[PDB]
Design an enzyme around this catalytic site. Structure first.
Site, PDB file in Angstrom:
ATOM      1  N   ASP A  34       2.023   3.090   7.758  1.00  0.00           N
ATOM      2  CA  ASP A  34       0.908   2.161   7.572  1.00  0.00           C
ATOM      3  C   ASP A  34       1.374   0.850   6.913  1.00  0.00           C
ATOM      4  O   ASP A  34       1.307   0.678   5.680  1.00  0.00           O
ATOM      5  CB  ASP A  34      -0.266   2.793   6.810  1.00  0.00           C
ATOM      6  CG  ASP A  34      -1.538   1.945   6.794  1.00  0.00           C
ATOM      7  OD1 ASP A  34      -1.621   0.975   7.572  1.00  0.00           O
ATOM      8  OD2 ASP A  34      -2.449   2.254   6.002  1.00  0.00           O
TER       9      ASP A  34
ATOM     10  N   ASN B 214       1.320   7.477   2.380  1.00  0.00           N
ATOM     11  CA  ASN B 214       1.870   6.554   3.359  1.00  0.00           C
ATOM     12  C   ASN B 214       3.375   6.798   3.521  1.00  0.00           C
ATOM     13  O   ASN B 214       4.079   6.001   4.140  1.00  0.00           O
ATOM     14  CB  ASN B 214       1.574   5.111   2.942  1.00  0.00           C
ATOM     15  CG  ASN B 214       0.182   4.668   3.315  1.00  0.00           C
ATOM     16  OD1 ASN B 214      -0.443   5.271   4.176  1.00  0.00           O
ATOM     17  ND2 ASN B 214      -0.296   3.602   2.696  1.00  0.00           N
TER      18      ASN B 214
ATOM     19  N   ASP C 241       0.863  -1.171   0.000  1.00  0.00           N
ATOM     20  CA  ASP C 241       0.000   0.000   0.000  1.00  0.00           C
ATOM     21  C   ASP C 241       0.902   1.224   0.000  1.00  0.00           C
ATOM     22  O   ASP C 241       0.659   2.193   0.722  1.00  0.00           O
ATOM     23  CB  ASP C 241      -0.977   0.029   1.186  1.00  0.00           C
ATOM     24  CG  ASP C 241      -2.153   1.019   1.094  1.00  0.00           C
ATOM     25  OD1 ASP C 241      -2.454   1.539  -0.014  1.00  0.00           O
ATOM     26  OD2 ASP C 241      -2.791   1.266   2.138  1.00  0.00           O
TER      27      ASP C 241
ATOM     28  N   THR D 243      14.288 -20.263   0.322  1.00  0.00           N
ATOM     29  CA  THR D 243      13.093 -21.077   0.478  1.00  0.00           C
ATOM     30  C   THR D 243      13.419 -22.481  -0.029  1.00  0.00           C
ATOM     31  O   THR D 243      12.816 -22.941  -0.998  1.00  0.00           O
ATOM     32  CB  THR D 243      11.854 -20.451  -0.195  1.00  0.00           C
ATOM     33  OG1 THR D 243      12.186 -20.064  -1.527  1.00  0.00           O
ATOM     34  CG2 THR D 243      11.294 -19.240   0.523  1.00  0.00           C
TER      35      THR D 243
ATOM     36  N   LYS E  58       1.336   3.870  -1.348  1.00  0.00           N
ATOM     37  CA  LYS E  58       0.884   5.107  -1.964  1.00  0.00           C
ATOM     38  C   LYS E  58       1.509   6.311  -1.256  1.00  0.00           C
ATOM     39  O   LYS E  58       2.021   6.230  -0.132  1.00  0.00           O
ATOM     40  CB  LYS E  58      -0.646   5.178  -2.057  1.00  0.00           C
ATOM     41  CG  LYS E  58      -1.400   5.103  -0.751  1.00  0.00           C
ATOM     42  CD  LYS E  58      -2.865   4.784  -0.944  1.00  0.00           C
ATOM     43  CE  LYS E  58      -3.532   4.487   0.376  1.00  0.00           C
ATOM     44  NZ  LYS E  58      -4.841   5.169   0.521  1.00  0.00           N
TER      45      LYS E  58
END
Length: 312
Positions: free
Chosen positions: A159, A142, A137, A179, A139
């Site tokens: 955030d 933020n 997020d 992994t 953006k």
């Protein structure tokens, strides 16, 4: 069946209102309210995000903040509580405002300042990505200033509410370098994508810093369908009054950061190797020719992220 220390915060004798005075709001929403608070003992002011546990579970967020808040350019957790119903995340208050807005109201902003700003932000994301965190997020609203100094040390990414720690089977936290617990080439590409969105969102920022308009919206009146349509078209102006004057280095970087194909979109790693970032010293310090419409831009920006987040 591991112990989570976060789950046990309702065991605390002391409560939030015991240590802090609450003040005004600064960010209401569906799940949470952000208020300014005063710490009784220190008369020091903070931000407190008051989350509703029935509406979501903020654990993933708090665990990321605990681990990675020590980063200079990541919002820093300062206290946290649980009264049963509400989680109270206390962090440093960002007195400096949103970074893009402040920057667009600086009429003598230059490319050289732009590169320093992107370097600091992209450095921080290179680190997150490298620990298999994605922000998702990222953006402009933020990314904030912790104070009015206007140093890149002031910059804070905020955030972490939709951010993802690359886990795997056995509920086990992973890096992108390890992994060996073979994870599906499904949810390597999920995270392999969500990295490159973070990078796309950084391209939007750089585009707007440079010209004073967002690349896929003119204002908040623009419709979702037509914003998505332009994003999809995968072309954009890097020509004309606003751009003519900007160095080809910068335009080049912008094209590869907003590149429509995620697989050919630059990494934070590669962003930081681009000469625009690397050879900052040979960039111009004189002013950019930008639209001066910060509040329009804010609307355009909100319209863009509301079209992307619509289906979710």
């Amino acid at each position: 069946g591991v112990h989570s220390i976060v789950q046990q915060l309702h065991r605390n004798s002391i409560q939030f209102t015991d240590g802090y005075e609450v003040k005004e709001d600064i960010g209401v929403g569906s799940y949470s309210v952000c208020k300014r608070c005063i710490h009784k003992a220190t008369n020091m002011e903070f931000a407190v995000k008051i989350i509703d546990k029935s509406k979501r579970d903020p654990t993933e967020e708090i665990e990321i903040l605990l681990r990675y808040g020590q980063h200079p350019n990541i919002i820093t957790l300062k206290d946290v509580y649980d009264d049963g119903k509400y989680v109270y995340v206390v962090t440093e208050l960002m007195k400096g405002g949103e970074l893009l807005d402040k920057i667009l109201r600086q009429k003598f902003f230059s490319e050289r300042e732009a590169s320093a700003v992107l370097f600091t932000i992209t450095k921080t994301v290179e680190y997150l990505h490298a620990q298999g965190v994605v922000h998702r997020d990222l953006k402009p609203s933020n990314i904030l200033y912790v104070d009015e100094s206007g140093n890149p040390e002031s910059i804070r990414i905020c955030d972490f509410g939709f951010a993802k720690q690359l886990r795997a089977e056995n509920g086990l936290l992973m890096t992108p370098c390890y992994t060996a617990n073979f994870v599906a080439p499904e949810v390597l590409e999920r995270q392999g994508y969500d990295a490159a969105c973070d990078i796309w969102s950084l391209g939007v920022l750089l585009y707007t810093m440079l010209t004073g308009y967002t690349p896929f919206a003119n204002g908040p009146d623009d419709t979702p369908e037509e914003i998505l349509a332009r994003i999809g078209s995968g072309k954009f102006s890097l020509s004309g009054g606003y751009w003519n004057s900007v160095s080809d280095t910068a335009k080049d970087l912008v094209s590869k950061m907003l590149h429509v194909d995620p697989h050919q979109r630059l990494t934070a790693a590669l962003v930081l190797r681009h000469p625009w970032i690397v050879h900052w010293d040979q960039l111009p310090q004189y002013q950019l020719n930008r639209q001066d419409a910060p509040h329009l831009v804010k609307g355009a920006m909100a319209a863009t992220y509301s079209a992307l987040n619509r289906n979710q």
